[PDB]
Design a protein around this ligand. Structure first.
Ligand code: 90U
Ligand code: 90U
Lengths: 301, 301
């Protein structure tokens, strides 16, 4: 038993991390087959980053301006192109540690593991959720750019995130591995605002199921509700509307506990209206929304 | 910026995980050089586990009774001995992925990463603190026994924990890699109680420094205190006494923020006496005690 925020084992991704230096800017790249992927701002000086023209900077770079290191081995760059906000560096050696992989674009509310890296070296691993406002609540210092986010399906690494920047509020913003940002952000050092964030309702229900499985059942009431009645209450608390798709996705947890989703919704409606009255749920005084239904099924069976 | 519970990258430990089967009991082992380490209760039937005689069970086992698998490769066991609550299985092949490693016994209050594994296969990675009462708050299902806890010092894996059991309260208990339990526990399925737990004061101060670094500074007051006055207040709230050793260990964080440790102690004394008055610290409505000073320096510089 027990419930913890857990990352995927990072080994298959550790074998893909390299250091990329262009001039005096160093950050991390992801080496898959004979390609290194990194944020395109590796080509900027500190001055450029205030308002960069990436096409103009990349023109004046050669293959030779890119120093790519995997441990004490230099990889020769034999080609380079920009895809949206990501540089692709063709290199002379395919990575023999390349795992089975895919590039995916995740949806808001979904989680992934972040492998935080510095100078091509893995430092730590933790779980993030893609917020409704397309930011993530991470831990990134200078040198972490190019660190990636991923899920594992048995032996297959789904890469979904590459780290680019910190917004003025201290939340984090990045691209998919095609270099398209999540959210309405650009890779320029100028002030950018995220949308108001919202609470991921389906994940709060998942976490309430985890609490029940772990014996925290004080919030369970004898009531049911309708999806419609639930959403009319929850919208006042800035909860995302719960769809039938979400209800369907919670099916496995409803089956594991014998508690109907709309029964749980009635418990959550009461928690939102009445507060936690000085009680905790899985040790927490706040409702947690960064655990998906999958995160809960995976870990709790 | 930002602060998250972060595990060490698990790659160097993933390469050491194997499946160990004896009869119809399967669990995980740790393959280092030509030795596989696993919990000794791998030799028990469900009946035996209620009150086992491990020496009597191991006598009647041969090398051949132990099925050790690393992927689709069987490892032949060519010898076996018991060290306290751990089986050592000599095998015919040294593990070529053996990292630089040490066996350490951690102290209460210290953290480690747990690589949760099932059938020799890594599933997830998360941080735990060794509680003052020698339990850990983990996430372990059936099949997780033999999963290990570790710290990494650059390229060196310090193994400090192997998972054996769940106490009736749902906290977790295990041994060092010499098979000595943390705490007054035995590997038998009979009801066992941990001591009353206590709050790791030095870690709460570390986390308050992290909150300051991340701009959460509302709890900072103009006061100082003495170690003695602090400990007389904190003992009523079931906080461990703060020693000069702890004060010394917080030195780097005091230096990073320009806030004296005894200044922070005065802020914590007020939080303990007055509560959080409906405010949060790093998003949390409770004080966090499972981040060490090292966890905070590492991540926050
Ligand atoms: C990244 O380049 C790197 N080398 O690690 C860096 C990661 C930041 C640094 C602190 N936390 C992070 O997430 N990204 C940037 O510096 C990007 C880059 C300019 C500006 N910027 C950014 O994050 O702006 C805010 C900032 C905060 C702290 C330090 C530096 C900048 C662009 C957007 C191209
Ligand atoms: C371990 O053997 C395994 N095969 O994973 C198992 C891990 C438990 C199972 C659920 N969470 C865990 O931490 N350990 C045990 O089953 C040990 C073993 C007997 C009894 N016991 C144990 O944890 O007792 C409580 C229990 C809870 C759930 C399921 C089974 C038992 C000893 C102590 C030798």
């Amino acid at each position: 038993s027990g419930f913890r925020k857990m990352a995927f084992p990072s080994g298959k991704v550790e074998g893909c991390m390299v250091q990329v230096t262009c001039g005096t800017t160093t950050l991390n790249g992801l080496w898959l087959d004979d390609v290194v992927y990194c944020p395109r701002h590796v080509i900027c000086t500190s001055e450029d980053m205030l308002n960069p023209n990436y096409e103009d900077l990349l023109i004046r770079k050669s293959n030779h301006n890119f120093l790519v290191q995997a441990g004490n081995v230099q990889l020769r760059v034999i080609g380079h192109s920009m895809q949206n906000c990501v540089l692709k560096l063709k290199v002379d050696t395919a990575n023999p540690k390349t795992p089975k992989y895919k590039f995916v674009r995740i949806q808001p509310g979904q989680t992934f593991s972040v492998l935080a890296c510095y100078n091509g070296s893995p430092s730590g691993v933790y779980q993030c959720a893609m917020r409704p406002n397309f930011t993530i609540k991470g831990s990134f210092l200078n040198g972490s750019c190019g660190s990636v986010g991923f899920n594992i399906d048995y032996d297959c690494v789904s890469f979904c995130y590459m780290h680019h920047m910190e917004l003025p509020t201290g939340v984090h913003a990045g691209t998919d591995l095609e270099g398209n940002f999540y959210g309405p952000f650009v890779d320029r050092q100028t002030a950018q605002a995220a949308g108001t964030d919202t609470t991921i309702t389906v994940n709060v229900l998942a976490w309430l199921y985890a609490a029940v499985i772990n014996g925290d059942r004080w919030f369970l009431n004898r009531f049911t509700t309708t999806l419609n009645d639930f959403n009319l209450v929850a919208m006042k608390y800035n909860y995302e509307p719960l769809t039938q798709d979400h209800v369907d996705i919670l099916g496995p947890l409803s089956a594991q506990t014998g508690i109907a989703v709309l029964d749980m919704c009635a418990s959550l409606k009461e928690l939102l209206q009445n507060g936690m009255n000085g009680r905790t749920i899985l040790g927490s005084a706040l409702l947690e929304d960064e655990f998906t239904p999958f995160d809960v099924v995976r870990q709790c069976s």
